[PDB]
């Protein structure tokens, strides 16, 4: 699964 802390600017619905 994606690492949500790779880029904090990435925040999909």
């Amino acid at each position, epitope marked *: *699964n*994606p690492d949500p*802390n*790779a*880029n*904090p*600017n*990435v*925040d*999909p619905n």
Partner: antibody, heavy 121, light 114 residues
Framework: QRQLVQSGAEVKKPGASVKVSCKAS????????IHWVRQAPGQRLEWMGW????????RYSQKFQDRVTITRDTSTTTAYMELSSLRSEDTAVYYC??????????????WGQGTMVTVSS | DIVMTQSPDSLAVSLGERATINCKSS????????????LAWYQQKPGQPPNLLIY???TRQSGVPDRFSGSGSGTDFTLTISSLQAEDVAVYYC?????????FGGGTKVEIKR
């Protein structure tokens, strides 16, 4: 209009440190993370780290974690990257960037103009 | 490191011709939960920073000319320029934001024959 404006090109001796500034304007500074990315001659773009401009938390690449410090000053909406123990091989263009802001309210991607840093005796 | 590999390294077509750039990720950047691919395409010209063209693999950024389109899923991605214009000569890069560190491909240099 959303912008990032970087400090001017610099030259430093081997073993010295450099500090590049990144002045943000035209958006809510504290909402987003500023990344630092370097581009060395004929080399692929290298992500160095990010800072959350709000709380100041950072994440650094393994390649740079012992030598890089990313900081921010909310009062001046400016972020900074300091690279210490400079190698002549750290000669590169250093960018700050709001990489892929992809949220329910915003979809943008903004880069500073780049700061060339040469490490030379 | 999710390694991003681009093919070809350089291409040259005449004005108005279709241009195709391939990008392969060493690990799948697909997330089944939201059906998204964590991939972007950038254009860079000399002396300028890269400029974002496509994100989520296939969503063209508003204001980007619609001759630019992205496709693919998992580990195989394609940037298409349907009709290459003179201003499109540049190096094009794929980019993944699935895992840390963020990485970029080696670039494909797109050139005009005239």
């Amino acid at each position: 209009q959303r912008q990032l404006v970087q400090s001017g090109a610099e030259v430093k001796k081997p073993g010295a440190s450099v500090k590049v500034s990144c002045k943000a304007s035209g958006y809510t500074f504290t909402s987003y993370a500023i990344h630092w990315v370097r581009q060395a001659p004929g080399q692929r773009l290298e992500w160095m780290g990010w800072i959350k401009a709000g709380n100041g938390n950072t994440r650094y690449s393994q390649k740079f974690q012992d030598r890089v410090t990313i900081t921010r000053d909310t009062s001046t909406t400016t972020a900074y990257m300091e690279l210490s123990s400079l190698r002549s091989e750290d000669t590169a263009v250093y960018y700050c960037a709001l990489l892929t802001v992809l949220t329910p309210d915003d979809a943008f991607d903004i880069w500073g103009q780049g700061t060339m840093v040469t490490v030379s005796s | 490191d999710i390694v991003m590999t681009q093919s070809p390294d350089s291409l040259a077509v005449s004005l108005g011709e279709r241009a195709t750039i391939n990008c392969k990720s060493s690990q799948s950047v697909f997330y089944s939960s939201n059906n998204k691919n964590y991939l972007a395409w950038y254009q860079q010209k000399p002396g300028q920073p890269p400029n974002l063209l496509i994100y989520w693999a296939s969503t063209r950024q508003s204001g980007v000319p619609d001759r630019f389109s992205g496709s693919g899923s998992g580990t195989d991605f394609t940037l298409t320029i349907s009709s290459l214009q003179a201003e499109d000569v540049a190096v094009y890069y794929c980019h993944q934001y699935y895992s840390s560190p963020l990485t970029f491909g080696g670039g494909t240099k797109v050139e005009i024959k005239r």
